[PDB]
Amino acid sequence: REIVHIQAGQCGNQIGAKFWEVISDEHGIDPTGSYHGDSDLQLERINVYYNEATGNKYVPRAILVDLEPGTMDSVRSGPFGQIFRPDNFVFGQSGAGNNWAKGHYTEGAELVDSVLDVVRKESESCDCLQGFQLTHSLGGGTGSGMGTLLISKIREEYPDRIMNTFSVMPSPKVSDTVVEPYNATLSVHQLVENTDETYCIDNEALYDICFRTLKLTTPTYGDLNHLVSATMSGVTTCLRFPGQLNADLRKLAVNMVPFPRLHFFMPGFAPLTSQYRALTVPELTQQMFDSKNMMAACDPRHGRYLTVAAIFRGRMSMKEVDEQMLNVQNKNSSYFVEWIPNNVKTAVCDIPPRGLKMSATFIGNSTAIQELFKRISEQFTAMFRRKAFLHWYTGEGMDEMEFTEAESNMNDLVSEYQQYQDATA
Amino acid sequence: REIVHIQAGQCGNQIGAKFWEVISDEHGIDPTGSYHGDSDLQLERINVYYNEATGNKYVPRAILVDLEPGTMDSVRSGPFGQIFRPDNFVFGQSGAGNNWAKGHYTEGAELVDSVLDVVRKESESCDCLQGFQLTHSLGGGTGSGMGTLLISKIREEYPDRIMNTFSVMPSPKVSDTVVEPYNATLSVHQLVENTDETYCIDNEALYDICFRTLKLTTPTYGDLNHLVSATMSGVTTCLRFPGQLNADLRKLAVNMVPFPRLHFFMPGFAPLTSRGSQALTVPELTQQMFDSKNMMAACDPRHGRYLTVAAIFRGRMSMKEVDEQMLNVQNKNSSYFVEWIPNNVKTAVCDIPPRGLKMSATFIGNSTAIQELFKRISEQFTAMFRRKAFLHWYTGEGMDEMEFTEAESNMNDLVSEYQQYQDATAD
Amino acid sequence: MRECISIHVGQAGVQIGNACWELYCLEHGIQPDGQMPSDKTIGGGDDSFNTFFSETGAGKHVPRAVFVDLEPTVIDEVRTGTYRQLFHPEQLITGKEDAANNYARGHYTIGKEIIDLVLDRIRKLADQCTGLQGFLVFHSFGGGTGSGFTSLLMERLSVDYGKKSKLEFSIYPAPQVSTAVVEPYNSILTTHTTLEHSDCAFMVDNEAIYDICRRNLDIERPTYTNLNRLISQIVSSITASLRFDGALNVDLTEFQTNLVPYPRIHFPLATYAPVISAEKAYHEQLSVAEITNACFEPANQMVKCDPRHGKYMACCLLYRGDVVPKDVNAAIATIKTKRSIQFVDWCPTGFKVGINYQPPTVVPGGDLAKVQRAVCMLSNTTAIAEAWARLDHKFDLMYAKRAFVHWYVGEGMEEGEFSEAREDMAALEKDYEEVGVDS
Amino acid sequence: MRECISIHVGQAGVQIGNACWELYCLEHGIQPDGQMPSDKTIGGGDDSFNTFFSETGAGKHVPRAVFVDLEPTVIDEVRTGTYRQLFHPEQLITGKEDAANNYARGHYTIGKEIIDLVLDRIRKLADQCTGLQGFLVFHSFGGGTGSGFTSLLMERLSVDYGKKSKLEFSIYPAPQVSTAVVEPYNSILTTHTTLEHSDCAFMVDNEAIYDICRRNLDIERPTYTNLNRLISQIVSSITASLRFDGALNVDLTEFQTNLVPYPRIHFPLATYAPVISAEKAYHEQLSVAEITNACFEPANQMVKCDPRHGKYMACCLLYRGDVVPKDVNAAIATIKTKRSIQFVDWCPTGFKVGINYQPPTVVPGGDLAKVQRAVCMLSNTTAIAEAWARLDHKFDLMYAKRAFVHWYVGEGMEEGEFSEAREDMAALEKDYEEVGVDSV
Ligand SMILES: Nc1nc2c(ncn2[C@@H]2O[C@H](COP(=O)(O)OP(=O)(O)OP(=O)(O)O)[C@@H](O)[C@H]2O)c(=O)[nH]1
Ligand SMILES: Nc1nc2c(ncn2[C@@H]2O[C@H](COP(=O)(O)OP(=O)(O)OP(=O)(O)O)[C@@H](O)[C@H]2O)c(=O)[nH]1
Ligand SMILES: Nc1nc2c(ncn2[C@@H]2O[C@H](COP(=O)(O)OP(=O)(O)O)[C@@H](O)[C@H]2O)c(=O)[nH]1
Ligand SMILES: Nc1nc2c(ncn2[C@@H]2O[C@H](COP(=O)(O)OP(=O)(O)O)[C@@H](O)[C@H]2O)c(=O)[nH]1
Ligand SMILES: [Ca+2]
Ligand SMILES: [Ca+2]
Ligand SMILES: [Mg+2]
Ligand SMILES: [Mg+2]
Ligand SMILES: [Mg+2]
């Protein structure tokens, strides 16, 4: 039933506000929180994300966290700003300075209890809480350092609930600071141990899609976040609308996580927008499995698919989506493990996203995701070999032992993906 | 910051009286003390040498001292005799008799307490005292013997202040007596130990400028003193006008004295022409300023090496011309500058020129060639001391004989120290 | 008179149970409000339909059924459906959290905290029985509740109701309508833990029901409503001997006696004919000889397998409608010489025939058409071992890499239970091999 | 919040502070009496310019600055200048006797008599802050006060404010306008003392700025007035990220993380473009590509060195004015191939870009032409070690003969403090050598 949403940091709050504004439009919720839609499928599972305030008002079960009031006042000043509960804004004034140590051990420690009070206050009012979803970046300080701190604190109090995150990977093509590989390697070390499902949203892939495909010479964060919100809306459709494929977080994890540490999903969307020609079901399936539509900069042909969840939105023939999906499996039969029979599952929703008649969302657990962590590890090692920029972290009480321990856990994850990329049956 | 000016002896009061005449004319002060000037730059640093009394009356911070009342009754009669403070006169009666021991040990000792009271009186009225400047000779008795005694006494009460002197070297070409080499050696031994800056004004070099250059067959003390007045007006321009190079005595000492004992400067002035000759450029000033003829000390700078040099230009001129000409003369004479002191030549340019000149140039050099001045005095000293001549003049005042050898051996070390750094190289 | 209690576990068991009880009312003329105008004994009686229906003082006929699901969404369909007034609120048991397609979650975690409540609601119906004969359990193989919790229920039913019969209606996993990749695991696990607590199990492959709906009924993409309405027709004709007067399979013991010679091999294959679409205005009428011949076509079986390359141990022909016995044995004589029927040498090569003169009933608005005669063939053939072989292979592929095992271990089950269940299936697969295969 | 207190020490620090604060007022619209008519929030507010300006109830906008000098004549010009009503009298601290170009007098003899009074005034300003970010310290390296007293002040600031960030705007000495021969001494002494107390220092070579004013502005003999008006433009571009807002505005502390890879390597090289006169700026539009190309010309840097002979560790471009990101990316890609920009192998070879939209302003009566766009480049290159070598060589020449050392020993210093400072300089030169060496 209920899911508690948390957005921490600049990137986490900016993509988190875009997620709430998109799904509110899909469920017929205006900025004031009133229902104004025509279909009854919009309120069938409205309580998985929205709390029903007295007066037919729907307030999101969202918690906004940051170490500085900057992005907080920016979210409140935009559209769908007054729909958020005012008591769920928890911010400090010092900031994290793009430092993972400041977000996790020094500055976030002062505010972590204020956040947990709102988390408890929202969870206490839940009839049947499934778990938590978190939006953040891994290359910054707050969403990276304090985000993984919140995950560890929440898992301590709700050990049997599902921990799900939308984690944004850093890329030199869209870089804020040079220490982004440091913050990323430290955060993934936490993600492999304290989360159950993680959607890998690579800023590298978002840039290449905006540049090489959408023909935007100078892409902005608003251009990247437009792709993120469309992907976030697609991967949560089975949670927000009636169905029975991956209707809840636990049933999704049982179908997508064959081994506990390999829980990093590669998302894909089709069509890529920013159009009057109508798309066809064979074209949606063709672009869904193409690397040009992957939200993570990985080549799926370089690895093998462990589990795949495809979901089609719009009004089409269930027979056609069955024909095209069974046909794309035959075209790429070499990229599906044989030891997991029937590892590709398909769902179909009738409500499409706004502005699109038909859409398709790809959710894959592929061993090719190791290229992402290998990329971060190469950028991490190039600096850590010379202990460059390490004084920003040791000045906050951190140790070099913690860096080597986080790097070794990353390399183990990579070699674990390689173990199943070559394992046959 | 303020400077306390002190003049001792006949020569010290003559050149000291002429000093207050030029700078008062430059700062627009009349013999009564009122400001008759027309430029605000004349009053910006007027308190360095003057006290501001009621009624806009500017009184010099001068202390006139001698062991005889003759020479100080005349400075009260000549021009600018009223502007001096009347109770700042301290005159004795017995006199010194051109005896260094008479001024330093016996007669000048009974008067040094009366002088010290006037010093503390003028020092009490100072917001932030810089130090003391002394005008005196090294050939006589009062300015030579008692002058040095005033240095040691004042240093004991003001040890962290700057002690500057305008010492006049004796010369047999204008010599008053014959015992002058004895007085110079005994006083240079004192000036080595108890002063921070000393402007060596050689009477020999002064006589040669008047005779050979200005063409004065019979040079009087007034002709020699006019060159001294132009010098002390030049070496004090950076202290009297809103500059920023060597604006005070301590910043000048840090720039000019690399080793504590080597603090005897040779000064130069340009232009130097008489009233019988007749378009002076910046390159001409720079050339004449580094010429041996324009040196106010009988020393050829090309016989030694410049440790540090301070250049002061006065008048309306192109500042780019000065920078290029100052850089020019340094490259063309690179061998005569020590290489282990980088950028040892500082140049200041004052807007207003001295009286009667369009542009002037004053030179302040710390050159190892100054040893020629000390070698000459030491040679005349040892010519008399070998024969024990006139030792009864000094031993008659209770002095000792080895006190003469101490003052000599020191001077010999001073010459050796100057030679030690002249031969030193960077590699 | 002897009463039967039906238990529906999981989504598949509840929704199939909803379709069956709707059909029972249509066949017996029971109205959705519980009233039965054709019944003359108000508030009691010992009729044949009383084995499945109990009567209140107000003449209301209540199904002897229990609905159990660990999530309330599927049960709410029954609570607000067309026959909502048919059931008491105490016959419907809902949990808060389902088993997440995890056998370990439905058996050990959620099953531990709900097993005593379900048995309490079961005992309340058993105390209303003068001679309870046994239970019929409806559940799926791949669901967490349908496999996990059902296994615990049969283990407890053998303790609280010993010597009573237990019949299964199971749903074999099919990928065209499957929702989980771990269904193969859950299937083997429940089969091993129930093999000794079940006397007869009717397995229905959703693959076969799916294709019958596509070929014979012209549904392009069949849904659960299409599958369940066809499945309830087979369940109806199997249980019609308990609900109507007759002599063949009048009680649950006779099912195991007639169809189960060896206890471990208690998975009889079901074949149904004819399946005609309603939109087919043209309405040919197949003779008994034609519909009996269709009972040997693999396209009409509930599990896709080849009985030509197996051996028969028991055979039961259940006719329903305008069928005379003279036409039956005439068809059996013609089918002897035209088919590959090989019985085991320790059994008589014969057929037990049951005729019910009342013809089948179709739900108004369904996809099935009205016929004058139909056959349901219950045969215990070794050819059904193919379904076990396909299931064991998919189990071996995943378990060789220990894939998804951590979901079960983290729920309390130990890894040794997996190989213990797989060893039982390897023994079951060899039991079929000894009875059927020769040199 | 995020207030910054500026400290101006000595003549150079005071006179540069005068030029900066005059430029700040022109950029924000603050009048010489402290009134800002555009400011609608009277008595306070959390605007961007409030990081450098506090507000009184009367609407006056007061700079968060302290001017301190051991002599009064330079600060007296501020007390009677055009912006005399801008500062409170307690913000201007003067002594009666300066340090006389002596580090020993600035740090010890004279400085100890005024240090507590200065820290008390700094505490008064720090108390008015809701979230003090750090200090900006303007001073010279060769003056007695700019070197000696600044060292004493930085040491006391680390005691009173812990590891709160402290940025330096230092003046590297040049013989063209040098006032003392012992300036190499005071430079080496103050660099060694403040090294572990400074998080980032922006050196400005007086000879570099002097030469820029000669070639690019056609001033035949530049003065401090000419040099300071150019220096304040670099200071304005660096701090513009803190005093203004915008979508593309990147905080300077975000550059500081990129600029300082190791604690001792915190000396970024600054470059400003365009530096053009009005006579040449006429009939001359300067695109983004031209000013970005001028940043890599060695004759445009704040410190005399050759970045082609070194390796880059960080590169930050700070644009202000009519600049769009499309033009920046095009200019950077062009320079990436037409120029040889060698980065160290242990850091990415990227360019961090920040864009302000407030165009550069000029003081009325200045030498700089009013342009529509400008750029300041902050880069961390090993080539800046050349400035340390030249300065250390002048030190070694004089110290070998112990010339002028008696002026420092007489004030209380020991000869060991000289060799200790020189040894630290030699280690710093080796540190810049080691970071350029490739990995094993
Ligand atoms: N024929 C048929 N099969 C069904 C139906 N519902 C589910 N299934 C099948 O049963 C399997 C899933 O079992 P479910 O009954 O959904 O699971 P459950 O018992 O509710 O278990 P949990 O939800 O995990 O607690 C899959 O193979 C489905 O295709 C139905 O109404 N009819
Ligand atoms: N750019 C620039 N350099 C200056 C300025 N004033 C002085 N300098 C330089 O700074 C050095 C001298 O330091 P100052 O600031 O004058 O000295 P101070 O700090 O007042 O020290 P003291 O007067 O000795 O107590 C020389 O290299 C000068 O060229 C100025 O306004 N601008
Ligand atoms: N896709 C995307 N990435 C962002 C966004 N904002 C920041 N990032 C990235 O996130 C990283 C910086 O983390 P940030 O969220 O700014 O830090 P925090 O506020 O301390 O959590 C860098 O890799 C940025 O490129 C955004 O709106 N969208
Ligand atoms: N230049 C210069 N030298 C003088 C003057 N008066 C005396 N001397 C020299 O000073 C020396 C004698 O010193 P004197 O003035 O008698 O000193 P006193 O004993 O203190 O009065 C001789 O070498 C004189 O030539 C003077 O007015 N000008
Ligand atoms: Ca009855
Ligand atoms: Ca305001
Ligand atoms: Mg950021
Ligand atoms: Mg279910
Ligand atoms: Mg000064």
DSSP sequence for D369-420: PP-SEEEEEEEEEGGGHHHHHHHHHHHHHHHTTTTTHHHHHTTT--HHHHHH
Instruction: List, as ranges, residues 189-228 from A with C-beta within 8 Å of D.
Output: 217-218
The backbone region for B244, taken as left when phi is positive above 0, alpha when psi lies in -120 to 50, beta otherwise, is alpha
Residue D361's Cα: distance from chain center in Å? 19
Residue A356 shares a structural domain with residue A248? no
- Measured from the Cα of B171, ligand 4's closest atom is 23
Residue among D79, D82, D88 nearest D32 (CA): D82
Burial A127-154 (b: 16+ CB within 10 A, else e): eebbbbbbbbbbbbbbbbbbbbbbbbbb
Measured between alpha carbons, how far is B398 from B396 in angstroms, rounded to an integer?
A: 5
How many residues comprise chain B?
A: 427
Q: Apex CA D14: angle with CA D11 and CA D18, to 5°?
A: 135
DSSP line for D101-154: T-HHIIIIITGGGTHHHHHHHHHHHHHT-SS--EEEEEEESSSHIIIIIHHHHH
A346 to chain C: closest CA residue: C179
Going by alpha carbons, the residue nearest to atom 6 of ligand 4 is B11
- Segments forming the whole domain that contains residue A193: 2-259
Helices vs. strands in chain B: H and E counts, helices first: 15, 12
Give the three-class secondary structure for C139.
strand
Contacts of B339 in chain D (CB under 8 A): 397
Residue among C59, C69, C10, C61 nearest C32 (CA): C61
Q: What residues contact residue A204 under an 8 Å CB cut-off, 6+ apart?
A: A169, A171, A173, A174, A297, A375
Residue D218: other Cβ atoms inside 10 A: 12
Q: Apex CA B237: angle with CA B231 and CA B238, to 5°?
A: 130
Residue B10 shares a structural domain with residue B41? yes
Structural domain tally of chain A?
3
Contact B285, B347 (CB under 8 A): no
| B and D interact (at least 3 Cβ pairs within 8 A) | yes
Contact D403, B256 (CB under 8 A): no
Q: Is C94 in the pocket of ligand 1 (CB under 6 A)?
A: no
Helices vs. strands in chain C: H and E counts, helices first: 15, 12
Residue A139 shares a structural domain with residue A214? yes
Residue B177's Cα: distance from chain center in Å? 22
* Adjacent-strand bridge partners of C63: C53
Task: Output the CA–CA distances (angstroms, integers) from residue D151 to A91, D98, D112, in the order listed.
Answer: 38, 15, 12
The domain boundary residue, chosen from B347, B367, B387? B367
Look-up: residue for tokens 């300003």?
Answer: D125
Interchain proximity C100–A251, CB inside 8 Å: yes
Interchain proximity B341–D181, CB inside 8 Å: yes
For chain D, the 3-state helix, strand and coil shares in percent, each to the nearest 5, are 45, 15, 35
**Ion ligand 5: residue ranges with CB closer than 5 A:** C 39, 41, 45
DSSP state of C170: E
Residue B155 shares a structural domain with residue B234? yes
The domain boundary residue, chosen from A234, A259, A284? A259
Domain ranges of chain C: 1-268, 269-383, 384-437
Contact A171, A204 (CB under 8 A): yes
Which CATH number characterizes residue B116's domain?
3.40.50.1440
Which CATH number characterizes residue A330's domain?
3.30.1330.20
Residue B319 shares a structural domain with residue B289? yes
- Ligand 5: distance of its center to the CA of C245 in Å? 15
* CA-based end-to-end distance of chain D: 45
DSSP state of C277: B
Contact C354, C250 (CB under 8 A): no
Which CATH number characterizes residue B409's domain?
1.10.287.600
DSSP state of B295: B
Residue B204: other Cβ atoms inside 10 A: 18
Q: Which helix (H) or strand (E) holds D62?
A: strand D61-63
Residue B229 shares a structural domain with residue B342? no
Task: Find the ligand nearest to D30 CA.
Answer: 6
In a domain, B427, yes or no: no
Q: Is D70 in the pocket of ligand 2 (CB under 6 A)?
A: yes
Second CATH level (architecture) for the domain D384-437: Orthogonal Bundle (1.10)
Contacts of D130 in chain A (CB under 8 A): 93
Q: Of the residues D8, D9, D11, which should be mutated to test ligand 2's pocket, given the most ligand atoms within 8 Å of the CB?
A: D11
- Tokens representing A232 are 């976030």
Residue among D385, D84, D22 nearest D231 (CA): D22
Residue A338 shares a structural domain with residue A201? no
- Tokens representing B178 are 């014959």
CATH class of D269-383: alpha beta
Residue B415 shares a structural domain with residue B289? no
Strands in A197-202's sheet, in edge-to-edge order, are A89-91, A62-66, A2-8, A129-137, A162-169, A197-202, A264-270, A358-366, A305-314, A344-349
* Adjacent-strand bridge partners of A58: A52
Measured between alpha carbons, how far is A49 from A43 in angstroms, rounded to an integer?
A: 11
Measured between alpha carbons, how far is A17 from A80 in angstroms, rounded to an integer?
A: 8
- Superfamily designation of domain D1-268: Tubulin/FtsZ, GTPase domain (3.40.50.1440)
Report the 3 state secondary structure along chain A. CEEEEEEEHHHHHHHHHHHHHHHHHHCCECCCCEECCCCHHHCCCHHHCEEEECCCEEEECEEEEECCCHHHHHHHCCCCCCCCCHHHEEECCCCCCCCHHHHHHHCHHHHHHHHHHHHHHHHHCCCCEEEEEEEEECCCCHHHHHHHHHHHHHHHHCCCCEEEEEEEECECCECCCCCHHHHHHHHHHHHHHHCCEEEEEEHHHHHHHHHHHCCCCCCCHHHHHHHHHHHHHHHCHHHHCCCCCCCCHHHHHHHHCCCCCCCEEEEEEECCCCCCCCCCHHHHHHHHCCHHHECCCCCHHHCCEEEEEEEEEECCCHHHHHHHHHHHHHHCHHHECCCCCCCEEEEEECCCCCCCCEEEEEEEEEHHHHHHHHHHHHHHHHHHCCCCCCHHHHCCCCCHHHHHHHHHHHHHHHHHHHHHHHCCC
* Chain A touched by D437 (CB under 8 Å): no
Contact B317, B349 (CB under 8 A): yes
* Chain B touched by D225 (CB under 8 Å): no
DSSP state of C359: P
How many residues comprise chain D?
A: 440
Residue B119 shares a structural domain with residue B241? yes
- Is the preceding omega at residue D222 within 30 degrees of 0, hence cis? no
Contact A366, A309 (CB under 8 A): no
Q: What residues contact residue C81 under an 8 Å CB cut-off, 6+ apart?
A: C18
Contact B229, B19 (CB under 8 A): yes
Residue B345 shares a structural domain with residue B274? yes
A306 to chain C: closest CA residue: C403
- Tokens representing C34 are 């519980």
Q: Of the residues B168, B169, B180, which should be mutated to test ligand 4's pocket, given the most ligand atoms within 8 Å of the CB?
A: B168
Residue among D286, D276, D294, D310 nearest D377 (CA): D294
Give the three-class secondary structure for D334.
helix
The backbone region for B21, taken as left when phi is positive above 0, alpha when psi lies in -120 to 50, beta otherwise, is alpha
- Tokens representing D32 are 């010489």
Q: What technique determined this structure?
A: X-ray
For chain B, the 3-state helix, strand and coil shares in percent, each to the nearest 5, are 45, 20, 35
Q: What residues contact residue D158 under an 8 Å CB cut-off, 6+ apart?
A: D166, D197
Residue B169 shares a structural domain with residue B275? no
Q: What residues contact residue A334 under an 8 Å CB cut-off, 6+ apart?
A: none
Q: Give residues preceding each break in chain C, C–N over 2.5 A.
A: none
Residue A209 shares a structural domain with residue A92? yes
Going by alpha carbons, the residue nearest to atom 8 of ligand 3 is A11
Contact D14, D75 (CB under 8 A): yes
